[PDB]
Amino acid sequence: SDRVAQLTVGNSSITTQEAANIVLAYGEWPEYCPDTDATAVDKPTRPDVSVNRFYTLDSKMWQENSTGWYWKFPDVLNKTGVFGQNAQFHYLYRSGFCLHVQCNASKFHQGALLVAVIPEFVLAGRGSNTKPNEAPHPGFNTTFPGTAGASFNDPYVLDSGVPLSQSLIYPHQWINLRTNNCATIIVPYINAVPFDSAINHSNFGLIVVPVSPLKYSSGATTAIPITVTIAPLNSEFGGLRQAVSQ
Amino acid sequence: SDRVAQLTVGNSSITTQEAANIVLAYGEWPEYCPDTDATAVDKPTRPDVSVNRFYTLDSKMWQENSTGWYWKFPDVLNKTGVFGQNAQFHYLYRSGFCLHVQCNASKFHQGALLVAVIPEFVLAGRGSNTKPNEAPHPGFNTTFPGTAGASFNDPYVLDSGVPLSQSLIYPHQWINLRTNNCATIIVPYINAVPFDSAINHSNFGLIVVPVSPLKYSSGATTAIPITVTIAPLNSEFGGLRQAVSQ
Amino acid sequence: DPVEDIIHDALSSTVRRAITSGQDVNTAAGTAPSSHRLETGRVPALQAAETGATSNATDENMIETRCVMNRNGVLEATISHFFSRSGLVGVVNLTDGGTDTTGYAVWDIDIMGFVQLRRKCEMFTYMRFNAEFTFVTTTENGEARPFMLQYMYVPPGAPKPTGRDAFQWQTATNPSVFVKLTDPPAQVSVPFMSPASAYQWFYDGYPTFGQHPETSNTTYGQCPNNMMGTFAVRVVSRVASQLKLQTRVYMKLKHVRAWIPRPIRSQPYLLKNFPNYDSSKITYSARDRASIKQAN
Amino acid sequence: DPVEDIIHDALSSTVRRAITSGQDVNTAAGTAPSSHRLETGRVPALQAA
Amino acid sequence: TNINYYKDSYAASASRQDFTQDPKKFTQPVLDSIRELSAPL
Numbered sequence: 087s088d089r090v091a092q093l094t095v096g097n098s099s100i101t102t103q104e105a106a107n108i109v110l111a112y113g114e115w116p117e118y119c120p121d122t123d124a125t126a127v128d129k130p131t132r133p134d135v136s137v138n139r140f141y142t143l144d145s146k147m148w149q150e151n152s153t154g155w156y157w158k159f160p161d162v163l164n165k166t167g168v169f170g171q172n173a174q175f176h177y178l179y180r181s182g183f184c185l186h187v188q189c190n191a192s193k194f195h196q197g198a199l200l201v202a203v204i205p206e207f208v209l210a211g212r213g214s215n216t217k218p219n220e221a222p223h224p225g226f227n228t229t230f231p232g233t234a235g236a237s238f239n240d241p242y243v244l245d246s247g248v249p250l251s252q253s254l255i256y257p258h259q260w261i262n263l264r265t266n267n268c269a270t271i272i273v274p275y276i277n278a279v280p281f282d283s284a285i286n287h288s289n290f291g292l293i294v295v296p297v298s299p300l301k302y303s304s305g306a307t308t309a310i311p312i313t314v315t316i317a318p319l320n321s322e323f324g325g326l327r328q329a330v331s332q
Numbered sequence: 333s334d335r336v337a338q339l340t341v342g343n344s345s346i347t348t349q350e351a352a353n354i355v356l357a358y359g360e361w362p363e364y365c366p367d368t369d370a371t372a373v374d375k376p377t378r379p380d381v382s383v384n385r386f387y388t389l390d391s392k393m394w395q396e397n398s399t400g401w402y403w404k405f406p407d408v409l410n411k412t413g414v415f416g417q418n419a420q421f422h423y424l425y426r427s428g429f430c431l432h433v434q435c436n437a438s439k440f441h442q443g444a445l446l447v448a449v450i451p452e453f454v455l456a457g458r459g460s461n462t463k464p465n466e467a468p469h470p471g472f473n474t475t476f477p478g479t480a481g482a483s484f485n486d487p488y489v490l491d492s493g494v495p496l497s498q499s500l501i502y503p504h505q506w507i508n509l510r511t512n513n514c515a516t517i518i519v520p521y522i523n524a525v526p527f528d529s530a531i532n533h534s535n536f537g538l539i540v541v542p543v544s545p546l547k548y549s550s551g552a553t554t555a556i557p558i559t560v561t562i563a564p565l566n567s568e569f570g571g572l573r574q575a576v577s578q
Numbered sequence: 579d580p581v582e583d584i585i586h587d588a589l590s591s592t593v594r595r596a597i598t599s600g601q602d603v604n605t606a607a608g609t610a611p612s613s614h615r616l617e618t619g620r621v622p623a624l625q626a627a628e629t630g631a632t633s634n635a636t637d638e639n640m641i642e643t644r645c646v647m648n649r650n651g652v653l654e655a656t657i658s659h660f661f662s663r664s665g666l667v668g669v670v671n672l673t674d675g676g677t678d679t680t681g682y683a684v685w686d687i688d689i690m691g692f693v694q695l696r697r698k699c700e701m702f703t704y705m706r707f708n709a710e711f712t713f714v715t716t717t718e719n720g721e722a723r724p725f726m727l728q729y730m731y732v733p734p735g736a737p738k739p740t741g742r743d744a745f746q747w748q749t750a751t752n753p754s755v756f757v758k759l760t761d762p763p764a765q766v767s768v769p770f771m772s773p774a775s776a777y778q779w780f781y782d783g784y785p786t787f788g789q790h791p792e793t794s795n796t797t798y799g800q801c802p803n804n805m806m807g808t809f810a811v812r813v814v815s816r817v818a819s820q821l822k823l824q825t826r827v828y829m830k831l832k833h834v835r836a837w838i839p840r841p842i843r844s845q846p847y848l849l850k851n852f853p854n855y856d857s858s859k860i861t862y863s864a865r866d867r868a869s870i871k872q873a874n
Numbered sequence: 875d876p877v878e879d880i881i882h883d884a885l886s887s888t889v890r891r892a893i894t895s896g897q898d899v900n901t902a903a904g905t906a907p908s909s910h911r912l913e914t915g916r917v918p919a920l921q922a923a
Numbered sequence: 924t925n926i927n928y929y930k931d932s933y934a935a936s937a938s939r940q941d942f943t944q945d946p947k948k949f950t951q952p953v954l955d956s957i958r959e960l961s962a963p964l
């Protein structure tokens with residue numbers, strides 16, 4: 087009665103049989119920018135069916151010695167669908183997201199994933215150089231991975247200095263292969279400005295860390311993939327001009 | 333709450349733990365022939381406890397390469413119990429049926445049975461002879477198998493020319509070894525006449541086809557039997573005379 | 579009162595409510611708008627075909643739809659208007675030449691001889707209807723020539739004609755149609771004449787009792803409630819008119835009622851009364867493709 | 875009126891209630907007495923992280 | 924307002940065309956009515 091669940095957005099739907107809950111980040115739904123908070127004078131555009139739907143990224147294979155992955159939003163949806171085109175043609179972007187991560191496994195596999203969102207997930211350069219002119223900084227592809235998504239190098243510190251233990255203060259959810267098989271999170275627009283660019287600043291990042299490593303006996307299925315799907319909700323765009331990829 | 337179920341008829345009862353539904357064929361219960369539709373003037377007989385009960389036929393072993401079975405009704409119950417005796421002593425017979433087919437298997441076996449009823453399941457002769465004087469016709473034991481039940485030769489055409497795909501328009505039910513373990517169907521009296529003979533014309537036939545073949549890993553139980561049980565409901569007989577077996 | 583297990587069920591065995599009430603549907607169903615619903619526990623997509631019930635997941639419950647006042651028609655889908663179109667049933671060949679000294683032709687009324695209409699009227703198991711017969715009659719070349727013809731209906735039991743000018747053609751009781759070859763086709767209306775309450779095209783059983791063989795079981799399935807007699811045709815004359823004649827029969831099914839639908843036959847027909855086929859050449863209903871994941 | 879899929883959501887996209895109301899907490903929370911409860915089906919210890 | 928010129932009812936043309944559907948006897952011929960938006964089992 088509470089394990090089964092169906093989400094539906096636009097022309098897409100998602101079923102699930104073992105996930106039990108919907109984590110609403112910070113207890114607020116995605117809403118449109120009210121007039122008392124808007125700064126842009128122009129009229130934005132609100133498709134609400136061309137962009138508000140479930141885009142399914144590629145799958146990442148969970149290995150026995152994996153280290154975790156991260157995505158940036160709305161970086162992933164900048165080349166796919168009408169969302170990608172609107173974000174490439176418009177300067178001001180605003181939207182909440184609905185994340186849904188699936189990693190199914192038999193009742194004999196064991197493991198646990200931590201699926202969290204990090205508002206303003208600033209990455210860090212791993213290096214002991216203390217002068218700001220020779221210090222290492224993460225490359226562009228390492229900080230804005232894109233639809234492919236990037237992997238961690240040392241997830242215990244989330245590649246951002248902060249420990250992973252306290253990362254549970256963020257809107258998070260576990261994928262425990264004994265109880266649930268997918269985790270979902272509805273996150274609103276989290277930013278210090280009414281609108282913002284969609285190709286320069288990524289509002290937040292998604293984190294999938296295999297805390298309890300995958301373990302199974304011989305003969306079971308070795309290829310355990312993880313699939314993420316994202317639905318931008320209550321999206322607005324403004325400031326139309328020629329297409330700028332980045 | 334909906335998986336558990338108990339049927340009770342006469343002095344017999346049937347339990348079930350994983351079957352979830354009761355398919356009422358064509359949305360009509362078995363009832364007695366009303367006076368506005370009766371043609372025979374004599375008074376029929378209605379035991380209602382001697383014949384209305386669950387007769388359990390023999391079991392058929394589902395093999396890895398089985399082809400399906402069929403039974404004819406009320407052909408099966410013409411030599412067993414007071415139903416058999418009433419059908420051998422009376423000329424006019426009328427009754428609905430309650431079918432219940434059980435095929436249990438561990439949570440590691442896989443397969444699917446299609447359990448359907450075919451009103452007027454006329455069988456066909458498999459042969460390309462086009463002259464009606466040399467054409468092959470099914471023998472008596474192949475068309476009225478009896479309590480033993482007969483097996484198919486090519487179930488894709490149901491031995492009747494018609495394809496098995498559209499056979500789902502009939503009152504049917506699946507036995508999927510991952511969800512349910514038995515299927516039950518309450519079928520009323522389906523015939524173009526108020527009463528009819530019980531030894532010449534078989535109102536309908538039962539069909540059990542292994543669509544998804546049985547598959548299991550080594551070490552599991554190989555002997556997976558199928559058991560059918562039938563309960564004639566709201567039975568009437570008329571036209572009493574000496575006993576005629578056929 | 580003295581024994582009440584007999585009254586408790588007699589006054590409980592009345593008509594049991596089997597509510598499946600239908601409604602008068604004039605046009606196709608419209609749709610209602612639907613937004614996105616992010617709720618747990620309420621899943622219209624997850625079904626269970628093992629219950630024997632078909633999925634009820636409609637459009638509004640799965641994707642975000644608009645509303646449409648659907649005005650499309652559904653009248654051409656009713657079985658009345660489905661069988662309201664006449665089709666060929668049987669053709670007789672009357673060779674009234676000098677070498678064929680018979681003079682009359684006889685046709686056992688059986689619409690299971692031509693696949694076009696048989697395939698339709700065999701998708702339902704029990705049918706009850708009134709027929710509208712139409713007889714076109716031409717020569718072998720397709721010409722009309724002013725020769726008067728007599729069609730007689732010989733119900734089961736009546737004496738069938740034995741000659742061109744036999745006494746059976748007096749038709750004192752048998753209905754008969756006299757019409758010229760150069761006139762519009764002869765059309766009559768025939769009622770539901772079966773002794774049963776409905777025609778059945780499939781009769782899983784035997785007509786009579788007794789021992790039934792296993793080699794030539796030529797009597798299986800042949801229901802007598804279907805055979806409705808015979809159709810005799812002659813040319814009204816005392817001497818032979820040297821011509822080859824061909825009478826085609828078309829039947830329209832009006833005031834139709836069908837019962838217990840049936841899968842539509844896939845394998846070709848081989849016999850009239852029997853639903854035979856050949857296991858050597860099983861014609862699969864779906865044409866073959868190259869691969870499964872290569873939709874053409 | 876002529877096309878109403880556009881009005882059905884415009885008048886449905888108002889402020890959606892996201893009730894998480896807080897209260898004015900002056901001091902730390904006290905406690906209430908509790909006896910032993912031997913009951914089935916009501917388990918406050920079993921959670922699901 | 925269709926008419927029949929003969930006193931026999933089976934000579935009329937299309938006496939009454941009807942719009943009466945009842946799919947719930949072929950599509951949902953079950954005992955306990957399954958809801959459209961709930962889980963079946």
Ligand SMILES: CCCCCCCCCCCCC/C=C/[C@H](O)[C@H](N)CO
Pocket residue numbers: 687688689690709711729730731753754755766768771777803804805806809
């Ligand atoms: C003078 C008029 C002659 C034409 C009228 C002949 C009577 C027609 C009786 C038709 C009986 C119902 C339609 C026949 C159905 C099937 O052929 C039979 N059930 C067996 O195939």
